[PDB]
């Protein structure tokens, strides 16, 4: 039925008994580069089962006060097994994804989470200096980031944070959040479903790019209807994020990249 599914990729399987169908972004399933759209001339590496499998990133907790969370792809998976290895050993890389967000509660809980997949999800910074966010802050990895309820300008001139300041109702980029529904999405309304499943093809203005310099997709999760339970002002339910890269192919092998951190 629309509600029961099983996803198998490599050596990993995911089962769900409360789905609300699955979304295939823009109606496009991920695919490899065709010869007619090929650019780099060298033989690509395609790890296949070693990289195209389900990786579970860290679990976040939803509370009445949560504003939202965000992650960047392939960034969030840079340290994930052999996918991360191939990402750092190659100059160029390409991949699609199957994003599976998990969140179960009970029949006496309420709340709705909007799960959006955004191509080129550029976020707003914290200073008066334009495009000032530094690489280390823009790429948090598997832990991702969070949305805020208001904009707060960083004034420390001696030691600028050079970080993002994504305000939730402004979708972290100066647009109204209610219009974010034009992007592939699903809603995890506690009275209806457990999860959200989105299949994302590779989207870019090029056939292949640098995975370290460029993040193709952004995953934004916003509480559309806040978490509430029985009478417990105190309520916490975890949100686990499991993502699997698809049709990975890398070009331009050399020595490994070791990016600067923190």
């Amino acid at each position: 039925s629309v509600r029961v599914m099983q996803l198998t990729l490599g050596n990993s399987t995911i089962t769900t008994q409360e789905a609300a169908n699955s979304v295939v972004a823009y109606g496009r399933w991920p695919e490899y580069i065709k010869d007619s759209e090929a650019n780099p001339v060298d033989q690509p590496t395609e790890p296949d089962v070693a990289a195209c499998r389900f990786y579970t990133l860290d679990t976040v907790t939803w509370r009445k006060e949560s504003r939202g969370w965000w992650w960047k792809l392939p960034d969030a998976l840079k340290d994930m097994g052999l996918f991360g290895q191939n990402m750092f050993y190659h100059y160029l890389g390409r991949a699609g994804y199957t994003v599976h967000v998990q969140c179960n509660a009970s029949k006496f809980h309420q709340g709705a989470l909007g799960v959006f997949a955004v191509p080129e999800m550029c976020l707003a910074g914290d200073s008066t200096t334009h495009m000032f966010t530094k690489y280390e802050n823009a790429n948090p990895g598997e832990k991702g980031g969070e949305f805020k309820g208001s904009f707060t300008l960083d004034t420390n001139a001696t030691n600028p944070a050079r970080n993002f300041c994504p305000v939730d109702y402004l979708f972290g980029s100066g647009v109204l959040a209610g219009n974010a529904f034009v992007y592939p999405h699903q809603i995890i309304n506690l009275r209806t479903n457990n999860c959200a499943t989105l299949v994302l093809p590779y989207v870019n203005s090029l056939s292949i790019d640098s995975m370290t310099k460029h993040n193709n997709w952004g995953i934004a999760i916003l509480p559309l209807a806040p978490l509430d339970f029985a009478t417990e002002s105190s309520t916490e339910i975890p949100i686990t994020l499991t993502i699997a890269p698809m049709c990975c192919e890398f070009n331009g092998l050399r020595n490994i990249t070791v990016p600067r951190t923190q």
Partner: protein, 68 residues
Amino acid sequence: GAQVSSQKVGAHENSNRAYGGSTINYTTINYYRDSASNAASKQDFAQDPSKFTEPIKDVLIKTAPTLN
């Protein structure tokens, strides 16, 4: 090398020319080798919004229960 297309007549004159003949056609000829120099033809097509309106894996009927 002339391209002859027909116009979509809005307001009609009390003439039969307003309803037929070359009088409701327009002629075009490209003078430049580079396609960039060309004007816009404006005979543009449409498409199915489904990729945005219903990017669902398992196709559903509106009459039928969405959650099944």
